[PDB]
Amino acid sequence: GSKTIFVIVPTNEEQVAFLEALAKQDELNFDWQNPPTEPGQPVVILIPSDMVEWFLEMLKAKGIPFTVYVEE
Amino acid sequence: GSKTIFVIVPTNEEQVAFLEALAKQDELNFDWQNPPTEPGQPVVILIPSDMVEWFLEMLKAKGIPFTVYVEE
């Protein structure tokens, strides 16, 4: 099992509100580890390889510091 | 930088208790994303590359189903 783990780290109300806002999107069907409410906290999200490009361009658009991980 | 993300998912009280127990170890200085109190849920633990062998062997000793991840 090689899944893509997306770890986002918000540093402002905009980043948090945005991360928590998208989290509501049930259409994503992602796997959230922790509730995106605390700013500066490393929010982990297990997403499929078929959604890595979307999240990548999504977070990159706003310029949010994230880190994509995968089963080494 | 490249951090060592250790994903441990308990399958019973044994694994859960062991995880929630080791988490108390302040000597570890790890980074827990979520409190491993629910069985079947993979907990994300951000540990250093200098403790990867420790955790890996630790989980292997009991035979807990985990998954190590690193910055691709």
Rounded to 5 degrees, φ, ψ at B71 are -55, 110
Chain A nearest C-alpha distance from B46 (Å): 10
| Count of CB pairs separated by less than 8 Å, A with B | 29
A49 contacts chain B (CB < 8 A): no
Question: What torsion, rounded to 10 degrees, do the Cα atoms B8, A71, A40, A35 define?
Answer: -60
B11 contacts chain A (CB < 8 A): no
Question: What distance in Å separates the CA atoms of residue B6 and residue B40, rounded to the nearest whole number?
Answer: 15
Rounded to 5 degrees, φ, ψ at A26 are -70, -20
**CB-CB neighbors (< 8 A) of B31 in chain A:** 42
Domains delineated in chain B: 1-72 (3.30.70.340)
For A48, the token pair is 């499929």
Return contacts of B46-49, CB within 8 angstroms, 24+ apart. B46/A42, B46/B3, B46/B4, B46/B5, B46/B6, B47/B3, B47/B4, B47/B5, B47/B6, B48/B3, B48/B4, B49/B2, B49/B3, B49/B4
3-state secondary structure of A71: strand
Question: What distance in Å separates the CA atoms of residue B23 and residue B44, rounded to the nearest whole number?
Answer: 12
Nearest partner of B39 among B6, B69, B19, B9, judged by Cα: B9
A2 contacts chain B (CB < 8 A): no
Residue B66 contacts residue B4 (beta carbons within 8 Å): no
Specify the experimental method: NMR
Nearest partner of B32 among B50, B17, B14, B19, judged by Cα: B19
Of A5, A34, A42, the CB nearest to B69: A5
